[PDB]
Amino acid sequence: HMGVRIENNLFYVESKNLSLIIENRNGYLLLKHLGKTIKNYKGSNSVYERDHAFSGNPTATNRTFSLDTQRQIFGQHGLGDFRKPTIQVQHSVTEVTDFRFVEAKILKGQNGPQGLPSPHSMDDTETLVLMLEDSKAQLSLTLYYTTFNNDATIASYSKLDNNSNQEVVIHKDFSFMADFPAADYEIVTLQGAYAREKTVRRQQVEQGIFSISSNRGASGHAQTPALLLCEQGVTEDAGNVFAIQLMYSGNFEAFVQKNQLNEVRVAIGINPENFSWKLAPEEYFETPVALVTHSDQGLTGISHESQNFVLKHIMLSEFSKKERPILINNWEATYFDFQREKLLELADEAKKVGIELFVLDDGWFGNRFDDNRALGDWVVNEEKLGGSLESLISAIHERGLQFGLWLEPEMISVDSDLYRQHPDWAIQVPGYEHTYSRNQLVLNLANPQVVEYLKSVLDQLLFYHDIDYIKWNMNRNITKLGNGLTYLETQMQSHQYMLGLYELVSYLTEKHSHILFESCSGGGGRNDLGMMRYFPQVWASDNTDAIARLPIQYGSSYLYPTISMGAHVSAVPNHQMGRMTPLETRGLVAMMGNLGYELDLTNLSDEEKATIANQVNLYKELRPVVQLGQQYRLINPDTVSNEAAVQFNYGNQTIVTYVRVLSVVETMETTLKLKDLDEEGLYKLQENGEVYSGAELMYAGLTVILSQGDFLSRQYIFRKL
Amino acid sequence: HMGVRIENNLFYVESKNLSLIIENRNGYLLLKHLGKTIKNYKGSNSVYERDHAFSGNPTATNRTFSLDTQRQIFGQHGLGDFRKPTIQVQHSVTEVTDFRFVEAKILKGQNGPQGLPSPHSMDDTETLVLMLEDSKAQLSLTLYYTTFNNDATIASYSKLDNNSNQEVVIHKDFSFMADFPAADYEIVTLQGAYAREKTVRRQQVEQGIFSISSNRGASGHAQTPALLLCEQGVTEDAGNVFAIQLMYSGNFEAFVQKNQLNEVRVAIGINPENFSWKLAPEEYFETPVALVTHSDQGLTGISHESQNFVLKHIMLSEFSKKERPILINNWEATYFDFQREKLLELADEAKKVGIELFVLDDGWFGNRFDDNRALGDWVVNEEKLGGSLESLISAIHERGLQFGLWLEPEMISVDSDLYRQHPDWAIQVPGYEHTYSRNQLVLNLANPQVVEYLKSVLDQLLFYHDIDYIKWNMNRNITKLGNGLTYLETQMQSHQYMLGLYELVSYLTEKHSHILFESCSGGGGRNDLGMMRYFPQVWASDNTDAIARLPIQYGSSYLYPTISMGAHVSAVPNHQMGRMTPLETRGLVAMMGNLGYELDLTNLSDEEKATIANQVNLYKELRPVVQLGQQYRLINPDTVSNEAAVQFNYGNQTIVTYVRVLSVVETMETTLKLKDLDEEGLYKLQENGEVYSGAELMYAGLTVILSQGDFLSRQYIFRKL
Ligand SMILES: OC[C@H]1O[C@H](O[C@@H]2[C@@H](O)[C@@H](O)O[C@H](CO)[C@@H]2O)[C@H](O)[C@@H](O)[C@H]1O
Ligand SMILES: OC[C@H]1O[C@H](O[C@@H]2[C@@H](O)[C@@H](O)O[C@H](CO)[C@@H]2O)[C@H](O)[C@@H](O)[C@H]1O
Ligand SMILES: OC[C@H]1O[C@H](O[C@@H]2[C@@H](O)[C@H](O)O[C@H](CO)[C@@H]2O)[C@H](O)[C@@H](O)[C@H]1O
Ligand SMILES: OC[C@H]1O[C@H](O[C@@H]2[C@@H](O)[C@H](O)O[C@H](CO)[C@@H]2O)[C@H](O)[C@@H](O)[C@H]1O
Structure with a gap:
């Protein structure tokens, strides 16, 4: 079953093959699990609470509870957490808030921020509504997490209400944040430049802060609103990937911060640069929609x-x-x-x-x-x-x-x-x-x-x-x-x-x-x-x-x-x-x-x-x-590869396009294996009329033959019989 | 001073900025040092003698002396050393020899193996002659190491004499070998293929045996008789390199073996494959000349x-x-x-x-x-x-x-x-x-x-x-x-x-x-x-x-x-x-x-x-x-580089050639710095008449400008004033 569930102090946000499980701990919201479906969650991976030096506490006498060390779903500055914050509102003489969970609701069907692009075809969705309040500042922050029954994606956004008698100013308000447990991680982003758009970049997560951002008033040629946090050693075919993306076309930031304990925070939203937002009494601000998408089938899994x-x-x-x-x-x-x-x-x-x-x-x-x-x-x-x-x-x-x-x-x-x-x-x-x-x-x-x-x-x-x-x-x-x-x-x-x-x-x-x-x-x-x-x-x-x-x-x-x-x-x-x-x-x-x-x-x-x-x-x-089929990357065109190959499947049709950049000499022909065929299927190659089993095409593959010359290409067209 | 010196049980082979220091230990020859000049060598880096399990001994009672663990200049099989051997002669029912040092001589001036290409212009050289005998087999092996007064190179070869009354058969006889102390090392070789000759290959030294070899009867397109053992992290400009090379055009092998203790053996010579050599009583066999060359100035140092x-x-x-x-x-x-x-x-x-x-x-x-x-x-x-x-x-x-x-x-x-x-x-x-x-x-x-x-x-x-x-x-x-x-x-x-x-x-x-x-x-x-x-x-x-x-x-x-x-x-x-x-x-x-x-x-x-x-x-x-000047590589054309640049200096002339393979767009121009100029020198660039100090050309460098297109090139020509 998919949708939203509230069970004692756990909230389960359950999309297809992806769950976000949040715990209400005395008004603080803790990220217990984001990943593959778990029912009847007990807490095997709970944070171990200990006294961490220079990590401070909401009460004098309990040194082992600290927002510096708990995994969270939104970030504040000034309460002991020193990781980068994702909500920061100026009110009176301060920009300290202390939003505490007060009430949860569940919606069904369509909803989203007014005035901003948001998902459609939402009949089979539910939305968790987490109502938070700062009683002193007389502000409300409401978090929304929406399930989808047909996709491993959860959507998120928030609304901040000014219920005070004075003007307040939003300085930071991201659309999604998650604290992931210390482990080895890589990140994939799409950057590049004009005439070099969406260049795929991969790197190790390192201590400190890595970010991509636009301050151009448009998302820009050189960075896409996406960040993929990947299990060490992810491939096209295998390993866990979490893609966070933003449905917004202006100034944005995505960041990954590795802190002093090796913990990892990721977030995406409106860029703090070139942004402040005044709210008069009774006014509210809704953020753009962020998406968190998951696959355990590597980078092709996340693409699909x-x-x-x-x-x-x-x-x-x-x-x-x-x-x-x-x-x-x-x-x-x-x-x-x-x-x-x-x-x-x-x-x-x-x-x-x-x-x-x-x-x-x-x-x-x-x-x-x-x-x-x-x-x-x-x-x-x-x-x-x-x-x-x-x-x-x-x-x-x-x-x-x-x-x-x-x-x-x-x-x-x-x-x-x-x-x-x-x-x-x-x-x-x-x-x-x-x-x-x-x-x-x-x-x-x-x-x-x-x-x-x-x-x-x-x-x-x-x-x-x-x-x-x-x-x-x-x-x-x-x-x-x-x-x-x-x-x-x-x-x-x-x-x-x-x-x-x-x-x-x-x-x-x-x-x-x-x-x-x-x-x-x-x-x-x-x-x-x-x-x-x-x-x-x-x-x-x-x-x-x-x-x-x-x-x-x-x-x-x-x-x-x-x-x-x-x-x-x-x-x-x-x-x-x-x-x-x-x-x-x-x-x-x-x-x-x-x-x-x-x-x-x-x-x-x-x-x-x-x-x-x-x-x-x-x-x-x-x-x-x-246009309508399933895409499979077979050889990726990057900085070192001399080749590109992409397969598409659609019912009884399978095509493969191969391109070689520079002419080569005295180099054995590439062997190009197809993916996602029926082993027992029979595949008739248009050019030579030969019929190959899917097993042959996937496990033996095609010897790719070209004449001498730069920038040559060929296409293989198969019909499954 | 350069040349050969015999001092108690040490032999010093002293070329310009390169010494080989060998110790005679009761008939066994130990490699004490190969590298930069040391006079009055005491043995700071001597092997520590201990009982190493399964490393056996020439005497029953001393378990800490083993040819399995001593650093040597030639290798035998069957006496306790299990590293790859470089001399192996069949005689009677065995191919065990036990060559023991008996006498040293020093020659001056030209010498080399008869019938094989060897160095010329040798007036200012000396040759260490290490006469070894196997009294039982009635065989002599004589090792030669030659100094050069103007180059950090030592030349080597050996002669094997059959002084027995029966035919003997040489199975292995390399031209040079050195045991280097356990450390992290990389190797550079030149391999490739027809129409891809001398492809520069670099890799980490790993436990086991790496080799290049020809069994083609010619040295071949796909491997050059050269192996460069390099300090971890060597660059064009810095770090220690030892190049071993062979003056031979037939079947050869170069190998690097990392053994069980992390020690490293390197050798080059006639390939054992397709080789055996019969010696009748009184006949002798001389190996081709090997060279060992050293630089502490990185890969450009070794090139020079x-x-x-x-x-x-x-x-x-x-x-x-x-x-x-x-x-x-x-x-x-x-x-x-x-x-x-x-x-x-x-x-x-x-x-x-x-x-x-x-x-x-x-x-x-x-x-x-x-x-x-x-x-x-x-x-x-x-x-x-x-x-x-x-x-x-x-x-x-x-x-x-x-x-x-x-x-x-x-x-x-x-x-x-x-x-x-x-x-x-x-x-x-x-x-x-x-x-x-x-x-x-x-x-x-x-x-x-x-x-x-x-x-x-x-x-x-x-x-x-x-x-x-x-x-x-x-x-x-x-x-x-x-x-x-x-x-x-x-x-x-x-x-x-x-x-x-x-x-x-x-x-x-x-x-x-x-x-x-x-x-x-x-x-x-x-x-x-x-x-x-x-x-x-x-x-x-x-x-x-x-x-x-x-x-x-x-x-x-x-x-x-x-x-x-x-x-x-x-x-x-x-x-x-x-x-x-x-x-x-x-x-x-x-x-x-x-x-x-x-x-x-x-x-x-x-x-x-x-x-x-x-x-x-x-x-x-x-x-x-x-043709007569000094060559400096500035950008190396390899598998990933999109560029090539090579400088030549000769007296008051400095030229630089730059080539770009693929056209690029929205990519900042390369900055190309020249090498080995006088900081205070004034260098007039032919194309624009501008005069630049050597400091500018070396430390600021040239912004390299090209139009759009593949395979474009340009040349900079300077005259020092
Ligand atoms: O939905 C959470 C908030 O609900 C109330 O305010 C909303 C306001 O955000 C906007 O949706 O306009 C409607 C119109 O009736 C409501 O006034 C609370 O005032 C907030 O504190 C917050 O709970
Ligand atoms: O030089 C070392 C060897 O010298 C003697 O033999 C040489 C032989 O190698 C060759 O050079 O021919 C000359 C001609 O006189 C000599 O016979 C010894 O017989 C070898 O044992 C070895 O010492
Ligand atoms: O003006 C029509 C043109 O607009 C956009 O491209 C241009 C490009 O032609 C010009 O060289 O540079 C500017 C920025 O300096 C724009 O990139 C469209 O993308 C192009 O398709 C065309 O419609
Ligand atoms: O025959 C003259 C030719 O000999 C060598 O090259 C050839 C090459 O032309 C031919 O295609 O292949 C054979 C091997 O199959 C040789 O590589 C010389 O190198 C070339 O310069 C020319 O002189």
Whole structure:
């Protein structure tokens, strides 16, 4: 049985194959167990209470009880625990609180923080409600833990109520924390950089504090809101992993602290940097949702658990199991230099090769002839489009293609009518020059007038035009915070910006629910689970190099389903890397993702056109396997590997893609073994017609043969008989 | 003072900054110290003698003296030492010997084993002669250790005399052995493969036995006769290294054994595999020369020590400091498909770009139109050469080029007149079919008639033709050993083959000492210090890819001077790797070696011709710096590095070559610091005219800037003012 149970002083939060067991000890909440299901928990792994030097106590006479040494589910500073705190509220002359458990409730079905992205499809869930109070400060903190009956994930968030007669200020308020017992641990995170997104990083947990964080106002290219605490020696196939993740797209921190006793604290939430939150009497603050996910089946186990939870409970139901259109995007194809003739000719070529959707990228609005002006001016450039957008769309529709359109609503150019009319709408500090980034500024979405304006302009665009798809961009990070009437309002504006964004995108995605919205932030600059609540695919990276895409796709699909992961076949030499790669390899690499095209089809040879038509035909066949199937990493593209290989299973279809980076000589061929087949199953390999048992493919494997050369690839396609 | 000293029961072998101190303990020889100079040695690091269980004793009553636990300089089996032995002689019913020290002598000046390559320029050397006897077996073993006054190297070899009235058989006889005290050690070796020669390998010394060996009858592509025993944590710049090397080109073994007490034995010599040696009464056997070289300046220290010793005492004096000609070789250019017109046209183009030497590769002799016939038939194909070789050579000379010629004297084709006349000259076993390799057979150079024939044919070729250069090839390994009249003669034939080879090549190189002989064995299949005694350069690898050449050159110049290391600019796509690389990078990579050219100059554009002419002009300038200067590795090309950088210093000239393998994006530029400059020196960088102090270049370093793209390179050229 799954759900929530209250049994004497234990609370059991029971998801599928994952339990959190909390003990109420005289108002203090102790983490007894987080991990595989245990019923009738007795306490075999309880903390041994002893006098630990310099670890102090809530009472004078009992030296062996200390919040410095108890395992907890939230952290305070000032009561004897010196580990990093996760709740810290200023009230009167102090930022000491002492929240004590008073009452527990259980909810059933949907719930979550208002104004923030949270799980859906929650009918078969229960939520533990732990009501804590600080009687002196007259504050309440309420913790929520939600079970899921179909996934090894628990969701968490909290609400802080000010029940006092004075203003209070939240300084720290994370979404999840767990104290894990001293043991050897490794951590996996996804970091990297622009054009190197979601680089998989693994390291040993060491004494001290390790953290990843964004202070950019977006989660960022260089860190993902995820931290995987792993059993020493974890592999793809074996060992315990706990993934903590955050459904938030602004400033966040994830940290792991190893203290003086070798104990380990992990937490994730809103970054303390650039954050404070004023609460007037009777006001409350709810944190974004955190997730804790578990597998005992290594890193592939955690990928599957995380992907499944995302597909079922985050990504929009309307799209989570819907094959996504193969698109053409004109950006790398033309940049800003296009007009109607060029567009329809590209559309003609796209239709001939069987592409499904035509996306008009940057440059269609205002006087956007380059990237130095016009953001904020969402007026159609009818001169450039050679008539109305309506007439363009009709043209695209009549050629048999869906129509998509680029927006960047959060941004404003100094050189724009919007800025001329409302210069105060930009994020800025009185008496300081702007800081520029791609020669543009960020709109203050903490300003309700800004949100109202964007809802209006965009609702107008979407209702008056037959648009099938939106690409929602965001091309710089936030500087010069000073739009508040007070310092505290400025400290709130980064989170209020996010609330404004979510109000905006939840409104539009809900009001226009037939439209496929793809998120973007110079590629993967905001590829997190907050955005994926509303945008069921993401432009994974501006780097469209087939080879540079290998580690990027590795990371981008590590916790997120492949279906989310936009990938385009682009021109050579590649625009980012300056590299020639075979068209075959560009195709096979993009086909490990959500396939599209981004090159000038009108300038290709007849042969290159035929190749792309063949690629499109192939992917129409593989699309369900890739987008709806189960992903298995076989060879990981990292810093030292010269190879990449990824398998997908879906019913009677099994495919495997193999890529080799550098040509090798006098080196024995790799043996590549498949996973998760029926030993007794019979698998017919398309290329040679041979039938192999699943046992053979899994335990003997394929001798991988290639010619001489860099960046070569091949694909194996099997049908189970 | 350096040289040899005998002081009571200590013998001191004293080279520059390296001493071997041996103690005579009642006929047993103990290794007291090998390492930095110590005078007046007292024995601070003596073995503590105790009863070690299962370590037995030469006398009944003294359980604390055991050859199982004493550090020694040669190893026997059967007297209580169970570490791997380095001398083992069968006599009568046993292969137990008990060699006991009887007498020491000191020689001055040159000496070495007859018939085997050994150091030259030995006027300032002394040799310790340790005469050992086994009175029962009536055998003598004499050990030789030679000092050098200008290098931290000691040379060693031994002679075994049969003074008995019966035949005896040597089963094991290594050239050097040392027992090192228990400590943490790493080892560096050079292994790899064909087209991947001299791959630098580093690992921890572990309990048990690690070895590299050849049983191929040549030292081989996959292992070099070298083993570096290193202090834990050695770097390029710091820590103790002991390099043991062998001046031999046949079957060898190097091993490191960590025993039950954590002690470490290292040895190098003739491989026991495929070796036995019969001695009739009064006959003797001398082993090849081993070298032990030391540095306390890390791996660059050992490179310098090894290179210096090779330049001064191995490589021919006639060439060791002589700039080597920039050559054109036609092999990759035409393969077998050439005639006189094509040759002279290539020669014309070579002259225009300033090339100095023209080498005619395979296919000029017998009916060698492919690689399936004619080896053994060293008759000029006057039809193919369009007249006599004499007339061809005159033509090449008149165009201003030296002339070079390809030979493979050790080999015979089934389809050849030589085989038709003397089928028994091939290495073979009566009643077994041939084993084939590149469809050719190996000549039995253990057969004195074979050696006489080759001396004659080749002396004739060289005296009747004005040849400036020879490329001496050897394109397969030895199979089917059975040419002996007895089993024992067969067991001797692999070493006798080597003696035959050395007799042949010492004769020809001496009799034709103006000719530059470059050794070759499908590239680096026999690139060892035995060959380098007679052949002052070597074709480092058939792999002429600029990028694949990086780890190859790293290894090929690790212990051997750059001047030895043949490197050719070749065509793209590269014939081995199937890869396009910039001509600039092919040039800069080959210029880190001994530069030549190997592509069809007649088929290049006018631009590619101008580029090569520029490369030749440049290298004429850099040649002394590269060939005669001091080499400093700055970034090593290994399995994980994406970079390579090598510096050369020579008087007032400092150059640095940098190569990046894969294009990178959003990655901060590398900072490359130079080494071994004068802090106060002023260094003018050619490209920008800026003057930097040596301190700046060494301690701040160069920000390395590149455009986008794979396989890019650049060079920095400095002049000290
Ligand atoms: O749910 C826990 C809290 O409940 C009460 O306040 C809530 C407030 O948080 C918000 O949900 O608005 C509703 C509307 O009725 C309630 O006022 C308590 O005041 C808090 O102390 C806390 O228990
Ligand atoms: O040099 C040590 C040996 O000297 C004597 O033999 C040598 C022999 O090795 C070889 O060098 O030929 C010369 C020619 O006179 C000598 O015979 C002893 O017979 C050996 O026992 C050994 O001492
Ligand atoms: O402007 C259209 C373009 O926007 C985003 O990419 C850009 C990139 O082209 C430019 O070079 O840099 C900025 C940041 O400096 C952005 O990354 C989209 O990601 C891209 O797909 C395209 O739509
Ligand atoms: O035959 C001339 C050729 O000999 C050696 O190379 C060859 C190589 O070309 C061929 O492909 O393989 C055999 C072994 O199978 C040899 O490696 C020389 O090294 C080369 O320079 C050339 O002279």
